[PDB]
């Protein structure tokens, strides 16, 4: 079922924006790892508060799981199916540790870093960025502005990576993760794709 972070026993007052994340994040009802949950929440806490507040206004939740995402009712229908953009026969949704784009983001604890069932630099930021794109910013990856940034700069940050060069919504979610994962990755984004950096930066102003 899950418990809201604000209703759990986890202490989070030193986590930035804990009041808004307390209403967004859902942690498991069953024994999980306090370190993995704390690192995932503090990473989400790097997001500008205006964006997090808009997510709460749109009733977006981020549920942290200790099991495959397809065990949850919301994603059960994806069992046995190839994820969008994946080569057939290389993966099913049951093996995917995170999913975003709707009002309930699912993120499996312990699979945040690259290679842990996925190829993102940060699973929770990538998955959450999908819901921000589709719900909070009304499919902003489809705007003419973002389409121009994607065609020009996606090859600069993800050269010869068909996944990001084919799906602009995927370029958005991973650029969002680069912006918020660390000072280093944000600088990488700023150096290789300065217009994309500026676009992600302006999201906090769009959310207010």
């Amino acid at each position: 079922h899950g418990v809201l972070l604000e209703e759990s026993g986890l202490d989070v007052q030193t986590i930035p924006s804990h009041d808004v994340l307390g209403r967004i994040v859902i942690v498991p009802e069953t024994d999980f790892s306090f370190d993995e949950a704390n690192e995932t929440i503090r990473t989400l806490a790097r997001i500008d508060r205006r964006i997090l507040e808009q997510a709460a206004n749109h009733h977006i939740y981020i549920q942290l799981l200790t099991n495959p995402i397809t065990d949850e009712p919301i994603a059960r229908h994806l069992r046995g199916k190839t994820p969008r953009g994946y080569v057939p026969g290389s993966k099913t949704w049951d093996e995917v540790p995170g999913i975003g784009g709707a009002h309930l983001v699912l993120v499996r604890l312990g699979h945040s870093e690259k290679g842990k069932g996925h190829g993102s630099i940060n699973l929770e930021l990538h998955a959450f960025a999908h819901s921000l794109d589709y719900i909070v910013f009304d499919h902003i990856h489809e705007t003419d502005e973002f389409q121009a940034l994607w065609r020009e700069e996606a090859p600069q940050l993800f050269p010869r990576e068909y996944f990001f060069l084919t799906y602009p919504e995927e370029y958005f979610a991973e650029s969002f993760a680069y912006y918020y994962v660390s000072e280093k990755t944000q600088e990488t984004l700023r150096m290789a794709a300065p217009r994309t950096y500026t676009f992600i930066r302006q999201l906090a102003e769009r959310a207010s």
Binding site: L78, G85, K91, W93, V96, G100, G119, A127, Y134, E174
Partner: peptide, 7 residues
């Protein structure tokens, strides 16, 4: 829409 992470 169900959106996955990169492969």
């Amino acid at each position: 829409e169900p959106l996955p992470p990169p492969p």
